[PDB]
Short mmCIF file of C-alpha atoms in Angstrom, two decimals:
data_model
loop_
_atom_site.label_atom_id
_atom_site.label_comp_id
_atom_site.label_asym_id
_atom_site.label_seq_id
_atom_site.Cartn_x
_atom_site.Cartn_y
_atom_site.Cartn_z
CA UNK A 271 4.64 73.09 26.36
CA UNK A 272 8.22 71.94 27.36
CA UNK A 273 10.82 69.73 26.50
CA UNK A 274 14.11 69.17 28.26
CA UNK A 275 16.52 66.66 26.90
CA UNK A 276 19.14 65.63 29.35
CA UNK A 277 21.95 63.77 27.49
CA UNK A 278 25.25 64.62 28.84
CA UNK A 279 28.17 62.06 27.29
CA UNK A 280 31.22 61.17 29.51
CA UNK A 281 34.32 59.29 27.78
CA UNK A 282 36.65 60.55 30.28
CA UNK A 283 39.38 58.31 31.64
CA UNK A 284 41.25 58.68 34.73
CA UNK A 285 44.11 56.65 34.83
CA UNK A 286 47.53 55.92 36.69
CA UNK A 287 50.42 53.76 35.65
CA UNK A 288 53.33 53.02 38.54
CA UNK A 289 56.51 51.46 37.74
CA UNK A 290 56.72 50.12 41.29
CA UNK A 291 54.96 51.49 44.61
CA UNK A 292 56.50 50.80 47.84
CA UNK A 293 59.22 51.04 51.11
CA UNK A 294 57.28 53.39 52.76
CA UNK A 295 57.78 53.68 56.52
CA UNK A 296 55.20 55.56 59.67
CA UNK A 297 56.62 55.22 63.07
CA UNK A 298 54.18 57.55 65.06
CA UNK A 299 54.92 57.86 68.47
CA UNK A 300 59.05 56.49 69.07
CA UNK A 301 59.22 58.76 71.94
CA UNK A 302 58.25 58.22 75.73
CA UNK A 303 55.20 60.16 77.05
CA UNK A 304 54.82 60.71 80.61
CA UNK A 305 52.13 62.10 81.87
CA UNK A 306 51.49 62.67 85.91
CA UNK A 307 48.73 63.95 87.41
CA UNK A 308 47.85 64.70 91.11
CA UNK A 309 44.75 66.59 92.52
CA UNK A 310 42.77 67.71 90.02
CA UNK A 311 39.26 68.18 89.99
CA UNK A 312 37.11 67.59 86.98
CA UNK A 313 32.91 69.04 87.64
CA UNK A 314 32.17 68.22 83.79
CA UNK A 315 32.81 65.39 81.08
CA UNK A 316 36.44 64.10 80.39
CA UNK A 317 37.70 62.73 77.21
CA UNK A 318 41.37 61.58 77.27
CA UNK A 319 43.41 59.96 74.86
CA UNK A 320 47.69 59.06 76.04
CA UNK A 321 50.34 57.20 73.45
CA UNK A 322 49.62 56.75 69.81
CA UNK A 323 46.29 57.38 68.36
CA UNK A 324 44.32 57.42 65.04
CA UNK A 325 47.42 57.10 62.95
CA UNK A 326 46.75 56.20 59.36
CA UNK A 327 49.47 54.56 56.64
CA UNK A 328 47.23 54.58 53.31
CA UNK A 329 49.09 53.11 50.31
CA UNK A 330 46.52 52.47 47.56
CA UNK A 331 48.02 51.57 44.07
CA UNK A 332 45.60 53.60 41.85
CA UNK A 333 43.59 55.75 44.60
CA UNK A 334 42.14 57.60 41.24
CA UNK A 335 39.02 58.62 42.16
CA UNK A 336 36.25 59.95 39.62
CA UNK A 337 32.89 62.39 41.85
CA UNK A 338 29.91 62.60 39.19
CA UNK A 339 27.03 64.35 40.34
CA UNK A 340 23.28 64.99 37.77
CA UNK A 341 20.49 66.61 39.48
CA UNK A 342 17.28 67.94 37.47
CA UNK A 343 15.38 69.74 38.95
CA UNK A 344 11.82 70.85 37.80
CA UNK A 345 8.56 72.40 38.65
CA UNK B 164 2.07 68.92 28.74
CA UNK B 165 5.88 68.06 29.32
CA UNK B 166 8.53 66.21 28.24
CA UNK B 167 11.86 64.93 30.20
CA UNK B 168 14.31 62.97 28.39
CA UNK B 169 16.88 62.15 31.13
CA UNK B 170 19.75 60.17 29.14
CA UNK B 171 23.17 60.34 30.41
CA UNK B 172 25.63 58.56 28.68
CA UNK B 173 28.71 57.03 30.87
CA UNK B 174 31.84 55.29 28.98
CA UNK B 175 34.32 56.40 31.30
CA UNK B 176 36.85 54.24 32.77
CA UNK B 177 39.22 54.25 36.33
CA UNK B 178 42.15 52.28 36.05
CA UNK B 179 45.18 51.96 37.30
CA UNK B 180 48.41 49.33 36.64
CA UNK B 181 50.85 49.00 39.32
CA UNK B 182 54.46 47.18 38.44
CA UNK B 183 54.82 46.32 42.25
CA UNK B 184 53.13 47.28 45.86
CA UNK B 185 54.97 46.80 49.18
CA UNK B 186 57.30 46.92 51.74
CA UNK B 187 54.92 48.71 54.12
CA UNK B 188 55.90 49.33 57.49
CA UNK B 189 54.03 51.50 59.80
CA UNK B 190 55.36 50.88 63.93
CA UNK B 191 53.10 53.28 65.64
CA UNK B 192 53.55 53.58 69.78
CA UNK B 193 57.18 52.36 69.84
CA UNK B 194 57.55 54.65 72.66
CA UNK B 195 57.31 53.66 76.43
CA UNK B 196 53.74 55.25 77.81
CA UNK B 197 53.67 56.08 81.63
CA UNK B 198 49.87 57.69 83.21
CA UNK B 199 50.43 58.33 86.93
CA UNK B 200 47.30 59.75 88.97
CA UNK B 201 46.71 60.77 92.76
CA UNK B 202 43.90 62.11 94.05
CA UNK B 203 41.83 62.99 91.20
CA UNK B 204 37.84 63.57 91.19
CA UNK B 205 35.58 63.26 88.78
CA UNK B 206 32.05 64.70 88.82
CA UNK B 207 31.15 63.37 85.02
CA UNK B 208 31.42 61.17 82.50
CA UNK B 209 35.50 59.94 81.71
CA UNK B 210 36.49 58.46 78.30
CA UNK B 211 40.08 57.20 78.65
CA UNK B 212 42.42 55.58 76.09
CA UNK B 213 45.67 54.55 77.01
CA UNK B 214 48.09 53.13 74.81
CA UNK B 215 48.24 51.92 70.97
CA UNK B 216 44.58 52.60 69.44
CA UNK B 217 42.87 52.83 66.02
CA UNK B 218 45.86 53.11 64.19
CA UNK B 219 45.12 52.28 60.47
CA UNK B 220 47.01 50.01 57.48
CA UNK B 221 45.26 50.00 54.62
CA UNK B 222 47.17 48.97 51.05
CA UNK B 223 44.60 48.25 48.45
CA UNK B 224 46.08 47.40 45.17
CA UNK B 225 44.02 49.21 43.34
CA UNK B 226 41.35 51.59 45.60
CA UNK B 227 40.08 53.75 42.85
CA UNK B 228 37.00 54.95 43.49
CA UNK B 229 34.04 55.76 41.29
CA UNK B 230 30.85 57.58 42.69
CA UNK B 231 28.27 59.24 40.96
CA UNK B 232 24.65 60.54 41.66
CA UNK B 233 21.58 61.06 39.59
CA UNK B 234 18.73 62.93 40.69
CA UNK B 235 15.23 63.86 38.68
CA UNK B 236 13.35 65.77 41.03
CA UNK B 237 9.32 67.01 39.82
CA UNK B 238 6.54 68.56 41.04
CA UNK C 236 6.86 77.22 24.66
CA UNK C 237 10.39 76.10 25.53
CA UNK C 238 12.98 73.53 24.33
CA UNK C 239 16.02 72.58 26.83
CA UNK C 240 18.78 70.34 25.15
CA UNK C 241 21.57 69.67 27.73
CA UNK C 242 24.06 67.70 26.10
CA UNK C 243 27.76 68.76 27.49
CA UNK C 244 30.49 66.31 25.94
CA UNK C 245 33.69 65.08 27.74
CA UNK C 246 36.46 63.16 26.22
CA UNK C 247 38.85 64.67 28.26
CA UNK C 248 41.95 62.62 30.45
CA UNK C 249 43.35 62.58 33.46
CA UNK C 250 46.71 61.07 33.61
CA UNK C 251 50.04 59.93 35.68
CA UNK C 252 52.84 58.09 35.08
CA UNK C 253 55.34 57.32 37.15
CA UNK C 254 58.83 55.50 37.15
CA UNK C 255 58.80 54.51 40.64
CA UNK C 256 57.35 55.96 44.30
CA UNK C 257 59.10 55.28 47.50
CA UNK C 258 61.77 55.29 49.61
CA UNK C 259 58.70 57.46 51.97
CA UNK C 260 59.76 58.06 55.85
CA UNK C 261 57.35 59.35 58.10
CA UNK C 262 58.81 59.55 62.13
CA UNK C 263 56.14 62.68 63.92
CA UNK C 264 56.79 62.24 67.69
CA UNK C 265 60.63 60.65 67.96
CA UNK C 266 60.99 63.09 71.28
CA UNK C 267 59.85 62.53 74.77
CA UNK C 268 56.71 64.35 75.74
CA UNK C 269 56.29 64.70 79.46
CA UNK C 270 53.77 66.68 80.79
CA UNK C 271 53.12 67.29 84.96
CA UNK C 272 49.92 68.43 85.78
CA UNK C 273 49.08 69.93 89.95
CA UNK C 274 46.06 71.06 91.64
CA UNK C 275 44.22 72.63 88.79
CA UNK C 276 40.42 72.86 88.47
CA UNK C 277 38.25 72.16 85.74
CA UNK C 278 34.58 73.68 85.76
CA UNK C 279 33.07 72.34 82.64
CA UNK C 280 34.17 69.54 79.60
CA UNK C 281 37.61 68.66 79.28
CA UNK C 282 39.25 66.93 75.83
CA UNK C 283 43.23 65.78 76.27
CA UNK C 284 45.18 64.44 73.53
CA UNK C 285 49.10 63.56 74.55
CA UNK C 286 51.35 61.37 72.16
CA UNK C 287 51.39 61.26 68.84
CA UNK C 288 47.67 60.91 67.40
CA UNK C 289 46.14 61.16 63.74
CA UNK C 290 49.57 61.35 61.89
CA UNK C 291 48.73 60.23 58.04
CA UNK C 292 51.25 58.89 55.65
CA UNK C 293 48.99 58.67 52.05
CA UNK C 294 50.75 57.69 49.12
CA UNK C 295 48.71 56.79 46.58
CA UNK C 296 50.31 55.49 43.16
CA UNK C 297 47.57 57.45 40.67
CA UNK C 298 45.96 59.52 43.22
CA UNK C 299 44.13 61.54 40.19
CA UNK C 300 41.10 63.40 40.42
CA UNK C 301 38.09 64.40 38.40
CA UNK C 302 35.34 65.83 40.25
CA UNK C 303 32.38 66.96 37.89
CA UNK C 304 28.69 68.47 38.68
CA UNK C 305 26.11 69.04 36.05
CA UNK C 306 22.53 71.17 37.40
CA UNK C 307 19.68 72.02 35.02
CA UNK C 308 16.90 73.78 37.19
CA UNK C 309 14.07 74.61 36.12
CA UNK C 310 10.86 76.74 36.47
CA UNK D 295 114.57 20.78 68.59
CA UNK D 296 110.89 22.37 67.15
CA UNK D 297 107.48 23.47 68.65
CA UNK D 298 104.88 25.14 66.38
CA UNK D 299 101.52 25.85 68.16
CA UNK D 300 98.99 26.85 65.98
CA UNK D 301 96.33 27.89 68.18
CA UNK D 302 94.15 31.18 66.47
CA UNK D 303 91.10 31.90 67.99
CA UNK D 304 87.58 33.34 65.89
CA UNK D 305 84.77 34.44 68.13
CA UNK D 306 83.69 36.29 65.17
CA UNK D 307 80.04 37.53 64.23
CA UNK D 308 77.97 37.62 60.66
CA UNK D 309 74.95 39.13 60.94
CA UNK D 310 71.79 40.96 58.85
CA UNK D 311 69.14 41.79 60.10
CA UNK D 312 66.53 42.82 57.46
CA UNK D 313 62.71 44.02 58.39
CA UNK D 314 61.43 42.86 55.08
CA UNK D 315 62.46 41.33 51.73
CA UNK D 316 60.44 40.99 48.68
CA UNK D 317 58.50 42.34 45.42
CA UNK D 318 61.37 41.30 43.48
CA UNK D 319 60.51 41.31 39.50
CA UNK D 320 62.26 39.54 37.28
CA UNK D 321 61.21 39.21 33.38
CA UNK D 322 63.95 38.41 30.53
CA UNK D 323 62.85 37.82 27.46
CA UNK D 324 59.71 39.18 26.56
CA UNK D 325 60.36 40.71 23.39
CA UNK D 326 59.87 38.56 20.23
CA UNK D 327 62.92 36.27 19.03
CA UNK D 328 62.86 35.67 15.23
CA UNK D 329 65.87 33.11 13.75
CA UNK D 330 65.89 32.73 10.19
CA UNK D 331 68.45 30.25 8.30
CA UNK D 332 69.29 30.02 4.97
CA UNK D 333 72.47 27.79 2.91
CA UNK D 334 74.39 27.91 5.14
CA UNK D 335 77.44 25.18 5.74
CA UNK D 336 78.85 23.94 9.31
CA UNK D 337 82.33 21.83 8.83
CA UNK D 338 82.74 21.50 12.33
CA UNK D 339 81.02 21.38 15.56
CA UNK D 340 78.00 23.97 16.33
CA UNK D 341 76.40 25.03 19.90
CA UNK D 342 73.17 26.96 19.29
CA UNK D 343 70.87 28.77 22.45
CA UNK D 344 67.76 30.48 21.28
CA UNK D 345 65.45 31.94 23.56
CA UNK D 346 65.40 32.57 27.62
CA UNK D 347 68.22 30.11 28.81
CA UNK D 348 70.07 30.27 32.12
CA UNK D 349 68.36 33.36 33.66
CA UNK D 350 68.23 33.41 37.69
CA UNK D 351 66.66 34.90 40.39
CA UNK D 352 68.55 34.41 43.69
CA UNK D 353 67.08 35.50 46.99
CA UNK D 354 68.39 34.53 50.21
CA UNK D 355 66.79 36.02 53.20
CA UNK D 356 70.85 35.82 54.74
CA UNK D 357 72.82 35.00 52.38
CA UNK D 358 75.64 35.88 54.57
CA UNK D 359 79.00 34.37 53.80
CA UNK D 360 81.96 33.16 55.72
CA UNK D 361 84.99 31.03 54.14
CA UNK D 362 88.26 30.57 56.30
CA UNK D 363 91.53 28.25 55.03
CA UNK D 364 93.87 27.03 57.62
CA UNK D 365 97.03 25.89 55.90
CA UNK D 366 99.78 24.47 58.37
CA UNK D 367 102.73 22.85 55.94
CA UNK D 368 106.13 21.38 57.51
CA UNK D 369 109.48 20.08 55.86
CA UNK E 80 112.60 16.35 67.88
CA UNK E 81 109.32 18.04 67.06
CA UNK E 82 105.93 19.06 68.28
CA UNK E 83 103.24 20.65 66.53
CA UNK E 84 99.74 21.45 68.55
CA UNK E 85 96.94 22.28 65.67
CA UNK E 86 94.63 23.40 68.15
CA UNK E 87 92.31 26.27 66.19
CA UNK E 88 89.39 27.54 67.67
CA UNK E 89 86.24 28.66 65.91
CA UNK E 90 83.72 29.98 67.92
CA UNK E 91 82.02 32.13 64.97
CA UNK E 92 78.42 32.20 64.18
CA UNK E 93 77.27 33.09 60.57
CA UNK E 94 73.13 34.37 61.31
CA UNK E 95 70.43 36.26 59.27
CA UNK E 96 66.68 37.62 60.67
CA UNK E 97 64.67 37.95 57.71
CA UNK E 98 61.00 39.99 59.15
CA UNK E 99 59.00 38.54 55.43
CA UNK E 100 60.27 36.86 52.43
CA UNK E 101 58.61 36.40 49.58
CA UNK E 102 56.32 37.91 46.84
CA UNK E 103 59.10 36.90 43.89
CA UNK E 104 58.01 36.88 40.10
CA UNK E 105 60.53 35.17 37.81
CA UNK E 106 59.05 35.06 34.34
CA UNK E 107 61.78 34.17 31.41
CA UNK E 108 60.87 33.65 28.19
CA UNK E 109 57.37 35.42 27.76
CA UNK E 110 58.19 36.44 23.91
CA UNK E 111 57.44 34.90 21.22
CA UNK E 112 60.32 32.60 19.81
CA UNK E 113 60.47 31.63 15.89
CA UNK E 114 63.38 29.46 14.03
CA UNK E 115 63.64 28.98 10.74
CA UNK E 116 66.23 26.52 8.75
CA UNK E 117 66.31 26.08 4.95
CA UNK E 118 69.51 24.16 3.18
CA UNK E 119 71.49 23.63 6.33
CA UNK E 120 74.29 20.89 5.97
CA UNK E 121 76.46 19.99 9.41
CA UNK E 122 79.84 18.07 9.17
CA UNK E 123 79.84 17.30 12.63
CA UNK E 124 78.13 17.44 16.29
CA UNK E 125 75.08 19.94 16.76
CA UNK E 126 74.17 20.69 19.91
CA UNK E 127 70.74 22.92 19.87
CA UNK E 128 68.45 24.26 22.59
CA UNK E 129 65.57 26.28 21.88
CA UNK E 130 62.49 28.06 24.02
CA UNK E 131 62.85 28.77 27.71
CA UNK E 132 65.37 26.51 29.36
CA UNK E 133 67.90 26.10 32.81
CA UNK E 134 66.56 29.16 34.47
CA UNK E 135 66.62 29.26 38.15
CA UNK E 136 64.44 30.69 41.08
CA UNK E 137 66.50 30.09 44.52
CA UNK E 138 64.58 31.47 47.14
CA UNK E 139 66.48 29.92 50.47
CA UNK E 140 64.94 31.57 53.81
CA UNK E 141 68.37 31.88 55.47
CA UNK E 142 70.99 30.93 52.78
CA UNK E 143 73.77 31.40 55.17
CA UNK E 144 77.13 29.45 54.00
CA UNK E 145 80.31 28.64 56.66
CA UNK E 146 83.33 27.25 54.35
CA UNK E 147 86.21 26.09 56.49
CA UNK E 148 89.55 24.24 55.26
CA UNK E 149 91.72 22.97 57.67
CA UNK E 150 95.45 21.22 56.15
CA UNK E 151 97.96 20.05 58.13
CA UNK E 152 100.96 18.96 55.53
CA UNK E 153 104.05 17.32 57.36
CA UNK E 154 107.21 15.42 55.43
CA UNK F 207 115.77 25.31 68.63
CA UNK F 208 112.83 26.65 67.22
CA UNK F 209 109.44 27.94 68.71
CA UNK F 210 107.08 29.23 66.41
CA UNK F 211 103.55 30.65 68.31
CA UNK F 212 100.62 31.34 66.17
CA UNK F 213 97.87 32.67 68.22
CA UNK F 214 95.96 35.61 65.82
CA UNK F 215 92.93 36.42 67.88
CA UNK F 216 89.66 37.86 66.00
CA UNK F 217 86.62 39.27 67.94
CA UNK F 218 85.62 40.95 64.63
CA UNK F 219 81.94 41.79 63.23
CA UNK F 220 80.17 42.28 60.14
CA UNK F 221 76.66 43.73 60.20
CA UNK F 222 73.79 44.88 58.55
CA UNK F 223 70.42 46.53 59.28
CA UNK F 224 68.00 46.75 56.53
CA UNK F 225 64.79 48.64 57.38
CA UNK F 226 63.15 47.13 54.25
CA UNK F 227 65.24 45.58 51.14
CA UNK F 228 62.41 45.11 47.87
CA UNK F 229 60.60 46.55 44.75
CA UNK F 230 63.67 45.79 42.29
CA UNK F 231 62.82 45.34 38.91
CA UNK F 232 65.07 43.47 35.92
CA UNK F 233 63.80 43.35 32.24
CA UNK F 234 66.41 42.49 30.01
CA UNK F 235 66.01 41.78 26.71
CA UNK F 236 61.96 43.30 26.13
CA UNK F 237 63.10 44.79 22.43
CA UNK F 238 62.76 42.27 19.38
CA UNK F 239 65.56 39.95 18.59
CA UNK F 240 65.91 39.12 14.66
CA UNK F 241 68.77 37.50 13.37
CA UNK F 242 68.68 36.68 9.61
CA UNK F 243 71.39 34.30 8.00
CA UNK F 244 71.83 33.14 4.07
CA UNK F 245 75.12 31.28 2.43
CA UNK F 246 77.35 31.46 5.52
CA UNK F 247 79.99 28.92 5.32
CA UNK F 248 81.84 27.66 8.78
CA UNK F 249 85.13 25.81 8.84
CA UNK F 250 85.55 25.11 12.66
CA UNK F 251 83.58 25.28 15.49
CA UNK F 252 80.59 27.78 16.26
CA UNK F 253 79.33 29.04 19.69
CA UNK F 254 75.91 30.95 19.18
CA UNK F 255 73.69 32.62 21.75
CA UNK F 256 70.75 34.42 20.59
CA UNK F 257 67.59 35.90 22.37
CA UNK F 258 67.69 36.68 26.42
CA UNK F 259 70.27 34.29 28.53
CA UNK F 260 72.78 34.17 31.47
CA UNK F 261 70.63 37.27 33.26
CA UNK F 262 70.91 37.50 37.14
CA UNK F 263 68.79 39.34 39.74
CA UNK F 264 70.74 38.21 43.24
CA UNK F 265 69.25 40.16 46.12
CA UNK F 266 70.48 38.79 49.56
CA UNK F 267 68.98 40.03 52.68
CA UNK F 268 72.49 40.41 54.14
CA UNK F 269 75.28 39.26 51.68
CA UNK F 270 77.76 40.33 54.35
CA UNK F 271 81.38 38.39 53.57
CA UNK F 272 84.37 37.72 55.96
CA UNK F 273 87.16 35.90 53.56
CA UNK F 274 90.11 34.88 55.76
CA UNK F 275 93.39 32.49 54.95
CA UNK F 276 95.94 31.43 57.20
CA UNK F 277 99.00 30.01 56.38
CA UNK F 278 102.07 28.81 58.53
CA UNK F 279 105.02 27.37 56.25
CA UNK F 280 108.07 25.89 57.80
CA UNK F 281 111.73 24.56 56.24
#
C-alpha cells in the first residue's frame, strides 16, 4: 500500500513600502529619421517598421510578484 | 490500495503601500519621420508601420501579481 | 509498503523599503538616424526596424520576487 | 521754467511653463495631542490654540508675481 | 512755469502654462486631541480654540498677481 | 530752467521650464504632544500654542518675481 500526504504550508509575505513613486520621464525617439529608398527589389516577404515603436513606460507601485507552482505526479 | 492527501496550506500575502504615484511622462516619436521611395518592387507580402505605434503607459497603483498552479496528475 | 509526508514550511519574507524613487530620465534615440538605401536586391524575407523601437523604462516601487516550485513524483 | 517727463517703458515678460504639477501631501498633526490642567490661576487675559490650526497648502499652477511702484513727487 | 507729462507705459504680461494640476491631499488634524481642566480660575478674557481649525487649501489654476502703484504728488 | 527726462526702458524676462514639479511630502508634527500643568499662577497676559499650527506647503508652478520701484523727487 501507499500513502502520500501533500501538505506544504506557505506564510510568506512579499511586501513593498514607497515613501513616494514618481517624475519619471521616456522620450523615445527625439531625433529625425530619414529614410530614402530608390530601386530596390524585394522577391520575398517584407516587414518594416520607421519612427517610434513598441516603447513601454511601466510604473507599477508594488509590482511584487509571488510564482507558486505544486505538481504531483503519480502512477 | 492508495492514499493521496493533497493539502496545501496558503496564508501568504502581496502587498504593497505607496505614499504617492505620478508625474509620468513618456513623449515617444518627438522626432520628425521622413520615408521617401522610387521605384521599388515587391514580389510578396509588405507589412509597413510608419510613425508613432504601440507605445505603452501603464501605472497601476498597485500591480502585484500572484500566480500559482496545482496539479494532481494519476494513472 | 510506503509512506510519503511532504510537508515543507515557509515563513520566510521578502521585503523593500524605500524613502522615495524618482527623478528617472530615459531619452534612447535624441540623434538623427538617416539611412539611404540604392539598387540593392533582396532574394528572400526581409525585417527593417529604423527609429527608436521597444525602449522600456520599468520602475516598479516593490518590484520583489519570490518564485517557488514544489514536485513530488512518484512511481 | 520746469519740464519733467516721466515716460518709462515695460515690455517685460513673466513666464513658467510647467509640464505637470501635483501629488502634493500634506498631513500636520497626526500624532496624539494630550492637554492636562490642574490649579492653575490666570489674572489677566489668556489665548489658548490646541490642535491643527492655521496649516496651508498653497498651489498655484503660476503663481508668478509682478509688483511695480511709480512714485512721481514735486515741491 | 511748469509741465509734467506722466505718461508710463506698461506693456508687460505676467503668464503661467500649467500641463495638469491637481491630485492635492491636505489632511490637518488626524490625531487624536484630549484637554483636560481641573480648578482653573480666569480674572479676565479667555479666548480658546480647540480641534482642527483655519487651515487652508488654495489650489488657484493660474494664480498669477500684477500689483501696480502709480502716485503723482504735486504742492 | 530745468528739464528732467525719465525714460528707463525694460525689455527684461523671467522664465521657467519645469519638466514635471510634484511628489512633495510635509508631516509636521506626527510624534505625541503632552503638555501637563498643576498650580501655575499667571499675573498678565498668556499666549499658548500647543499641538501642530501655522505649517505651510506653498508649491507654485512658476513663483517667478520681478519687484521694481521708481521714484522721481523734485525741490
Amino acid at each position: 500500500s501507499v500513502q502520500i500526504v501533500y501538505k506544504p504550508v506557505d506564510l510568506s509575505k512579499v511586501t513593498s513600502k514607497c515613501g513616494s513613486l514618481g517624475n519619471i520621464h521616456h522620450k523615445p525617439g527625439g531625433g529625425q529619421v530619414e529614410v530614402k529608398s530608390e530601386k530596390l527589389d524585394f522577391k520575398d516577404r517584407v516587414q518594416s517598421k520607421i519612427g517610434s515603436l513598441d516603447n513601454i513606460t511601466h510604473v507599477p507601485g508594488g509590482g511584487n510578484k509571488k510564482i507558486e507552482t505544486h505538481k504531483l505526479t503519480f502512477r
